[PDB]
Amino acid sequence: PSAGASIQAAGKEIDWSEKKLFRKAVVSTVFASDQVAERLRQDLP
Amino acid sequence: MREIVHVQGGQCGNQIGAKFWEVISDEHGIDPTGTYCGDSDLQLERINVFYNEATGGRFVPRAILMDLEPGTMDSVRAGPFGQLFRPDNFVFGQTGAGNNWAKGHYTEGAELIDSVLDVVRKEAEGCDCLQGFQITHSLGGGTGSGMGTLLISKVREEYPDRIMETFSVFPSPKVSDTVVEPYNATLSVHQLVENADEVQVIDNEALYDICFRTLKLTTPTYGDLNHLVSAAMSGVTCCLRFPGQLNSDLRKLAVNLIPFPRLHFFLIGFAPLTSRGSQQYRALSVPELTQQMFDAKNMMCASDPRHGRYLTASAMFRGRMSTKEVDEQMLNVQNKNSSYFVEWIPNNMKSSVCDIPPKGLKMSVTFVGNSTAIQEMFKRVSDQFTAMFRRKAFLHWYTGEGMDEMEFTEAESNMNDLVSEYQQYQ
Amino acid sequence: MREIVHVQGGQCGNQIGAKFWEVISDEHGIDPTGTYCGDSDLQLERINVFYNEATGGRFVPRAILMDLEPGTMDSVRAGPFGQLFRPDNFVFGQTGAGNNWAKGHYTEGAELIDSVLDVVRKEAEGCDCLQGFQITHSLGGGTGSGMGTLLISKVREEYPDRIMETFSVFPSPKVSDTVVEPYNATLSVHQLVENADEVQVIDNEALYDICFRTLKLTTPTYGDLNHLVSAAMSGVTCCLRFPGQLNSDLRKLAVNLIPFPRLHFFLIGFAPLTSRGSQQYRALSVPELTQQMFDAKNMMCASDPRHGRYLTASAMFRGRMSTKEVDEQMLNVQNKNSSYFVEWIPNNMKSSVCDIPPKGLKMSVTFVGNSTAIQEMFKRVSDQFTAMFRRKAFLHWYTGEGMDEMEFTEAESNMNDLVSEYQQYQ
Amino acid sequence: MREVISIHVGQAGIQIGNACWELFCLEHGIQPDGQMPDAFNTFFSETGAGKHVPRCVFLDLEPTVVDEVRTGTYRHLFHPEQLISGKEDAANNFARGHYTIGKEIVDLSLDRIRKLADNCTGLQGFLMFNAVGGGTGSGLGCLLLERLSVDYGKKSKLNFCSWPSPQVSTAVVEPYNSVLSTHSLLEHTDVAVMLDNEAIYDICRRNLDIERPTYTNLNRLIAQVISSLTASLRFDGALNVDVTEFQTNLVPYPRIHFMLSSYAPIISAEKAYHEQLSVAEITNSAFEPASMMAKCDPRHGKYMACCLMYRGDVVPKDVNAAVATIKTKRTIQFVDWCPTGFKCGINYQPPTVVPGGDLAKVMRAVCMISNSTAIAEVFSRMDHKFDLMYAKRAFVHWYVGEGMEEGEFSEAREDLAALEKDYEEVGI
Amino acid sequence: MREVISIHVGQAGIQIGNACWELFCLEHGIQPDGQMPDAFNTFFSETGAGKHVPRCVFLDLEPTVVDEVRTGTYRHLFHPEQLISGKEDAANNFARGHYTIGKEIVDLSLDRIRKLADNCTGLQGFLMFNAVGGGTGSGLGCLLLERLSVDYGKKSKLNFCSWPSPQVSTAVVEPYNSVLSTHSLLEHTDVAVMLDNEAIYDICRRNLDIERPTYTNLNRLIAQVISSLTASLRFDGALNVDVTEFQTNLVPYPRIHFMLSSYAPIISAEKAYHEQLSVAEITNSAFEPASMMAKCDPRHGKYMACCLMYRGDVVPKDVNAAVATIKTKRTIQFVDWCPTGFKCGINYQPPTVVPGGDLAKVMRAVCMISNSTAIAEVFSRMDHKFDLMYAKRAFVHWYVGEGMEEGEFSEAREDLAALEKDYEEVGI
Amino acid sequence: LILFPEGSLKNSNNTVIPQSHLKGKSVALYFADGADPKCASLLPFLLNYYRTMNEGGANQKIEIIFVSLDRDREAFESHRAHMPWLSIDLENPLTEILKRHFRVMKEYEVPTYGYGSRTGVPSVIVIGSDGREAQFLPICSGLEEGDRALLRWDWRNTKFA
Numbered sequence A: 001p002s003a004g005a006s007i008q009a010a011g012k013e014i015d016w017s018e019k020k021l022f023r024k025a026v027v028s029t030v031f032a033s034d035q036v037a038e039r040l041r042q043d044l045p
Numbered sequence B, C: 001m002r003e004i005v006h007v008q009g010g011q012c013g014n015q016i017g018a019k020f021w022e023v024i025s026d027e028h029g030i031d032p033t034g035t036y037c038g039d040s041d042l043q044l045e046r047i048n049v050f051y052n053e054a055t056g057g058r059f060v061p062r063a064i065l066m067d068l069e070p071g072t073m074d075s076v077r078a079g080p081f082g083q084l085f086r087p088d089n090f091v092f093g094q095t096g097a098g099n100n101w102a103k104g105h106y107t108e109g110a111e112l113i114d115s116v117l118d119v120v121r122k123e124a125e126g127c128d129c130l131q132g133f134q135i136t137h138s139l140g141g142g143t144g145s146g147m148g149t150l151l152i153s154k155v156r157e158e159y160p161d162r163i164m165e166t167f168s169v170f171p172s173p174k175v176s177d178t179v180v181e182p183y184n185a186t187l188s189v190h191q192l193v194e195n196a197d198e199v200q201v202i203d204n205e206a207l208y209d210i211c212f213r214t215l216k217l218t219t220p221t222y223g224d225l226n227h228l229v230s231a232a233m234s235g236v237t238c239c240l241r242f243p244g245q246l247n248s249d250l251r252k253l254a255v256n257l258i259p260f261p262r263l264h265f266f267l268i269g270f271a272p273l274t275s276r277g278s279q280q281y282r283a284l285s286v287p288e289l290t291q292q293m294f295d296a297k298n299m300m301c302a303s304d305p306r307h308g309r310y311l312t313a314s315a316m317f318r319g320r321m322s323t324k325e326v327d328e329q330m331l332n333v334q335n336k337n338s339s340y341f342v343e344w345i346p347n348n349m350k351s352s353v354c355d356i357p358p359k360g361l362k363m364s365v366t367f368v369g370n371s372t373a374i375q376e377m378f379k380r381v382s383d384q385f386t387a388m389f390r391r392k393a394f395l396h397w398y399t400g401e402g403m404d405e406m407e408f409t410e411a412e413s414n415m416n417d418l419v420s421e422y423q424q425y426q
Numbered sequence D, E: 001m002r003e004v005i006s007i008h009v010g011q012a013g014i015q016i017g018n019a020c021w022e023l024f025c026l027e028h029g030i031q032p033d034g035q036m037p038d039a040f041n042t043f044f045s046e047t048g049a050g051k052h053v054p055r056c057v058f059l060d061l062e063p064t065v066v067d068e069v070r071t072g073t074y075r076h077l078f079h080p081e082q083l084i085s086g087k088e089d090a091a092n093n094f095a096r097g098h099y100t101i102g103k104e105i106v107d108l109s110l111d112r113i114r115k116l117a118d119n120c121t122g123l124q125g126f127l128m129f130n131a132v133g134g135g136t137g138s139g140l141g142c143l144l145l146e147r148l149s150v151d152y153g154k155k156s157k158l159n160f161c162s163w164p165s166p167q168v169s170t171a172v173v174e175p176y177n178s179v180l181s182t183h184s185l186l187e188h189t190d191v192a193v194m195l196d197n198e199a200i201y202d203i204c205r206r207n208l209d210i211e212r213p214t215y216t217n218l219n220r221l222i223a224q225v226i227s228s229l230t231a232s233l234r235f236d237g238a239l240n241v242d243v244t245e246f247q248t249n250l251v252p253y254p255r256i257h258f259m260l261s262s263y264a265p266i267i268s269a270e271k272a273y274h275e276q277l278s279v280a281e282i283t284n285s286a287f288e289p290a291s292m293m294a295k296c297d298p299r300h301g302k303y304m305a306c307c308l309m310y311r312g313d314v315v316p317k318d319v320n321a322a323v324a325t326i327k328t329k330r331t332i333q334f335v336d337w338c339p340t341g342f343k344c345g346i347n348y349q350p351p352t353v354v355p356g357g358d359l360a361k362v363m364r365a366v367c368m369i370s371n372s373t374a375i376a377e378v379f380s381r382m383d384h385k386f387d388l389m390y391a392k393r394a395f396v397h398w399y400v401g402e403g404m405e406e407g408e409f410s411e412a413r414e415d416l417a418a419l420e421k422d423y424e425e426v427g428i
Numbered sequence F: 001l002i003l004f005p006e007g008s009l010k011n012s013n014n015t016v017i018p019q020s021h022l023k024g025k026s027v028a029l030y031f032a033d034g035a036d037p038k039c040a041s042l043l044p045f046l047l048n049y050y051r052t053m054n055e056g057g058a059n060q061k062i063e064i065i066f067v068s069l070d071r072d073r074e075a076f077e078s079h080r081a082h083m084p085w086l087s088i089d090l091e092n093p094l095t096e097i098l099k100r101h102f103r104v105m106k107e108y109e110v111p112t113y114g115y116g117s118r119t120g121v122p123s124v125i126v127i128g129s130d131g132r133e134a135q136f137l138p139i140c141s142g143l144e145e146g147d148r149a150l151l152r153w154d155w156r157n158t159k160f161a
Ligand SMILES: Nc1nc2c(ncn2[C@@H]2O[C@H](COP(=O)(O)OP(=O)(O)OP(=O)(O)O)[C@@H](O)[C@H]2O)c(=O)[nH]1
Pocket: D009, D010, D011, D012, D013, D015, D016, D060, D089, D090, D091, D092, D093, D131, D132, D133, D134, D135, D136, D137, D138, D162, D164, D169, D170, D171, D197, D215, D216, D218, D219
């Protein structure tokens, strides 16, 4: 019985933390405005 | 005081809603941490129109972001100005509304409408009195035409005394995104005409033509369309939040611009718009802003207003300006091309001035009109609908969720006699 | 001047009063050893209502830990805040009930009931004049529903004027844990209905959906339910410990909640309940706490109040507040709900501002209401009872330890007699 | 504190106990010399300087299976006086074990059982590990259990039987002595958990990937079964199940108490890391028809009560979710007098693994023990088997020789004929 | 969250799965063991400490390709018992895959996909990959979709067939196999795109200059197609679509659900350098009447619906303007009643190239899933290939002597002919 | 303690590695004979298994050390040129000490070392830190299942720590 270093099978560390209603989302250039944001701002470079 | 509940729905609805809070927060000095960096009383003297203080100096918005699919909630929250809303108001489904009106209005939206209605009555019954709701759904697709219009019937019968404005995005059949657009459009007109009082039709062909021909941008994206729409969105409710000489709430737009209670689909266009070069050559004054808003390559509907007539109109002038030039310029347009302005209404339009201009600008106009050229919108989608319904095209889904053959014939009828009610006032 | 004698029954009772004696002890500033370690002189005023002072400066709780399994109090005495109790009132059995109602109320509980009634009356007879007793009995099991309810019968005759307020945990069928929970529950009801004063019913099912749909946590333990009930245990006894602007004790909750002398069973809520994400975005003032109080999801019973009338109530607000936002929101919800409110009573609401909130919290409230909508949770158990008992299933071990068959058919004869009684006031 | 005196009879019971007492030693770490290099007081009795001695009485009328464990590795753990042995084997014969060769050993076995039942406070049950397939297991098992009925009347007396499996049968007289032992299993036993060889044959090939296991590999599975059953008594955890409430949630009528069993995470370590053993996965693998360790399709007969022994790191709420998963499934049927049909227990320490065995590490396991009406055709298949040899009375002269008045076969015929007749009488 | 079980049946279905579960592994970052050095939720259930496993079953009634994956590189990416095999295959016969050898494999496969569907309720649909030109692919694939309808029914069942080619068939009995399996292909699947082999040979003969391609190259182009339909099913994107949004927007009538597929650009290193990839350029090469991947000229028919999956560095107005130029060309016709026949979906993630493969590192790609009346041609070649052999009952004694009887061959004829009259009555 | 001294452990192309180059890996000895039909049948399976394990991953997971039970040095090198993993020279008495420690002999038993149980040829056996046995892969044993008992390996729970 000296073999006590037998690591657990199936990586089951059940989620003690709260759930995540939000998953990662890459910020997209297509839904980011730019362009007309500075055209409706009278920038005058 | 008077609060405007914002009832974003669908992928198009939440994306234009996020940019709407991106153009209202920068006017109100709001950081996306709820704080206020600014030095004017004028930004918080009426902060209760769109923002609610929650016990920590944070002005969380009144926005009820919904859909039936778990994707575009994540894009908004992780996006810019995203960590400003309330996650309880991020009410969503888990399945996918696959451009199907039947399972957005009748079956799948039925088990989510009760939870969304709880959220909207949460932030609407606790106030002094609400001025009115504000939906920004899209009238093409599954949950925009579905879940978006389903609540419109439910909260109309719950509050049948208040203004209900809808920045609906009509489908573009010239070049489109789906095939079942005619079904998702005709089955949403007949309940947007009986349970709504200010529709604001927005086409994507206009959003693409006027960003490229007027603004002279080679490739401006979806968020660029969102900022163009949301610029008009802020300019309709400018007078509610910011003070002005001739103020105008949403009900003031309705009382002056609705000839008959069924004729309430409105054109809308924001009309200072110069290109990258012409920002230093154009002259910002009231006559030049007046000429732009009647010019058809400023219009955000892509139904040409000079093919029809003008029952009535309006222009929310926004900025410091002299008020004679507000109203003497409007008979310059009413007397020059009087072939459009109809004869059974003298001085067809409603002017208004809110003193605070939008950010960066000095003077802006938000032209809203009721022209009988939107009957061309209901004409080209009628062409799409009668070609498909005559051959029972794409039907087994819709008859699959229980809704049957009969209500197409009054969906066509409610749109056809709406065209006939625009023929006999031009 | 007032004293409460607390007895914990069953493995549920000795683990829900294990956390109750944690939450009320740091509310009075008590070390695990027993010394006073607090920040306010407003902790050491009514220590007498839950504690007895010992030699040396060490307060000992008035807690009789009552069970027949010895292993439960071994874990309590080894866990935190369990060595605070006096060892001589750890009245432990060794045989233990087999989740039988006969095991405790007729055999192998009756020899030990003299051991528990002697230690109960030792704490009880030493008093100025006590309010009464609180018992955390656990309908569905064998010891809390068994010998714990015989404590309810055999304390009522020695103290017939002192209150018999009692917290209960009924067995919900989808969170069922023992097949004979129908037999244990309905045998524990028909004795509790004639010997009790205030039965605060709690369900494990509705403890799950308040932590899954409001506290926003998926499967992270069972002790989350114990702490949520333990806030409600101390929220009702706010005036017996701390001063209040308006005062109400449990005898106040007797006259203003029980209309007729068989209307005992009450519904319990607690509603400053905020999730992790909505912590920054939620206003913790009085209007947002009176709406979650009456939110049917927040109630700790799966016995939906919208499916029934609503006789009386008591609003136990706990935090420094103005009384003139307590009570207009009582009449606001009473006018705006209307039909879900009994009609032969003008005001169905009670209010009592307690001046000192629990630590962390600025402001709290605990619902104690008497609604007819506990009829469906009772009738749900009665459907279970008529399942096995119609053919006499699982019955040869309730008749082998004493009992005849007559007390089973009497347990249902006064069961449906009560649910009909709750029903016809609707 | 608590203790459960184990009584093993027959070579199957002895070899099963060689794996069960193997595994109890390594759960709470106890070396074969008794020494450890309050939880041990469920199967061990501390006496002296760390000399933990088991609570068992070995029994066999032949000196071959228990002399061999005297010379093995447990000469010192198993203290050498309760390893009761005889000389003449009962030879697959009920009339030998229940009669002439066997009264000499009941007297000494009852002595050491009485010494083991009156040396620790509040004994809690008797786990018998018998073998109804032969001689000493069935014959001495029946006589001994009939004496415990009067010596301890109020007493819980769980059994663990190896019933003759349908196609596998290593002795031809198994159908006789199986029916002859129903008299000892119908009115003298509280819990009758049913095991047989060929179902634990199949449970190891398709799940543990051993195509040639042995009775060691079988008895490791049985040792896992009773370890989960007695894990709540020995150890601590939320919502414990005692032996006192074990039969209270499984035995509806005093005569129908024949249960079954299924384990769940029986996977070798290769295809155990490749599956996430969730609560819903292991409970549906438990209710799988092929996971019963009896030839019993649990679909020709409706369930009556279940006892799902979860153990390890399991939360008490997703157990309710997975139970609700089973309830809504139409392939797992229930009968109409049980809107609730589950009593579940939960331990906290993980299901142990034997170093050198066929199992892996999991901190979860469902040892569900269920009392269904589908146990009836296990007995009724033996009814047709018994009648085919009794018609012209072969293998009978031995029984009639050492006892067995002709008519005990007839009363055991009608005893087991009344047994399954109760079963379809209950479920309608 | 969202997930699809990818059933891989037959021998060609396994060989497609060998290519798809290499491109998907490179796309998600999964090692051949399973660890990584939350988009991995539609394909890879997290069964470990970073150790993923595909939600797929490898199914072939012949053991030789199943064991070859079991001894290959991805022998630990896959759970060992997900790879279900038999011993005798079906050899080129519908009724062997459907009846005799199919008893003993459907019970364990449908059990396994039940244990792959219980990990989440939010399953989008099932995929099934087969070759309807031979024994196991058509034979077991028919019986699989039969029983899949009596289990989860509203759940979508897609299909990526490997239909016989005009002159390429590499079998002699294949018109009997293909025609007689159309019944499962017409009443039990929802999306039924055709993919014959020598169209893909033509793709890597004109656009890749490979005069000597193998089956492993064809599977790579198929795997790139599967990656681009389910690119939206795991990632972000401007326009997001799931599997039910395909069917509602591409299938006009319930019987008309056989699709065609194209993918562009299929280009290599010597080509990609001298050419500018603009959205109009890729959609032009996708719409040309030779890039169709099952041998069906769209000029000999009328389009009914068209789904395009833009993927990578693509802006929406380059989609929205170049789709107009397609509509203006007279060589392509939409029939009468779909003058919005275009479902465009935009992703951000570029198509990942398998290193040392045959494709470039293109930043933008389109896959076509289109419906047309032109695919009366792909089923009418089976009309004179089946009926001309069937005139005097060729290759019939295998099928009738093995369970199926004569007459079911007749039933397949009006099943295909009712499909043929259906496509000609819709487009007029 | 030390199992393999400084000059004992040599891999392919004859470079000696010390004990330091072996942690983090699942280590087995492999007692095999050159002329033995069991070994000749088992060796391609061991080669393929070793190649798949130690090629498809982010770490070198398993590792095998050869020990010859053959007759001479030419038979050593003829066997040795076929395996790529570690090995011990036959003339080192370390092989004989491992033979006596792990009981893997070849029926020459009473002439020198007359104890009992035998565990014959071949034997791949996984080892640990202090040279203790961990688990036996049952090629020729009580399970006697050949050419697939290599799959009974447990690399995660047996590591040379
Ligand atoms: N599970 C299991 N069953 C066994 C084992 N050994 C024997 N059996 C079964 O026991 C049944 C017969 O009982 P035996 O143990 O062989 O003999 P007995 O009960 O001691 O009585 P005798 O016949 O007098 O030796 C057979 O059906 C065997 O299948 C074992 O090690 N494990």
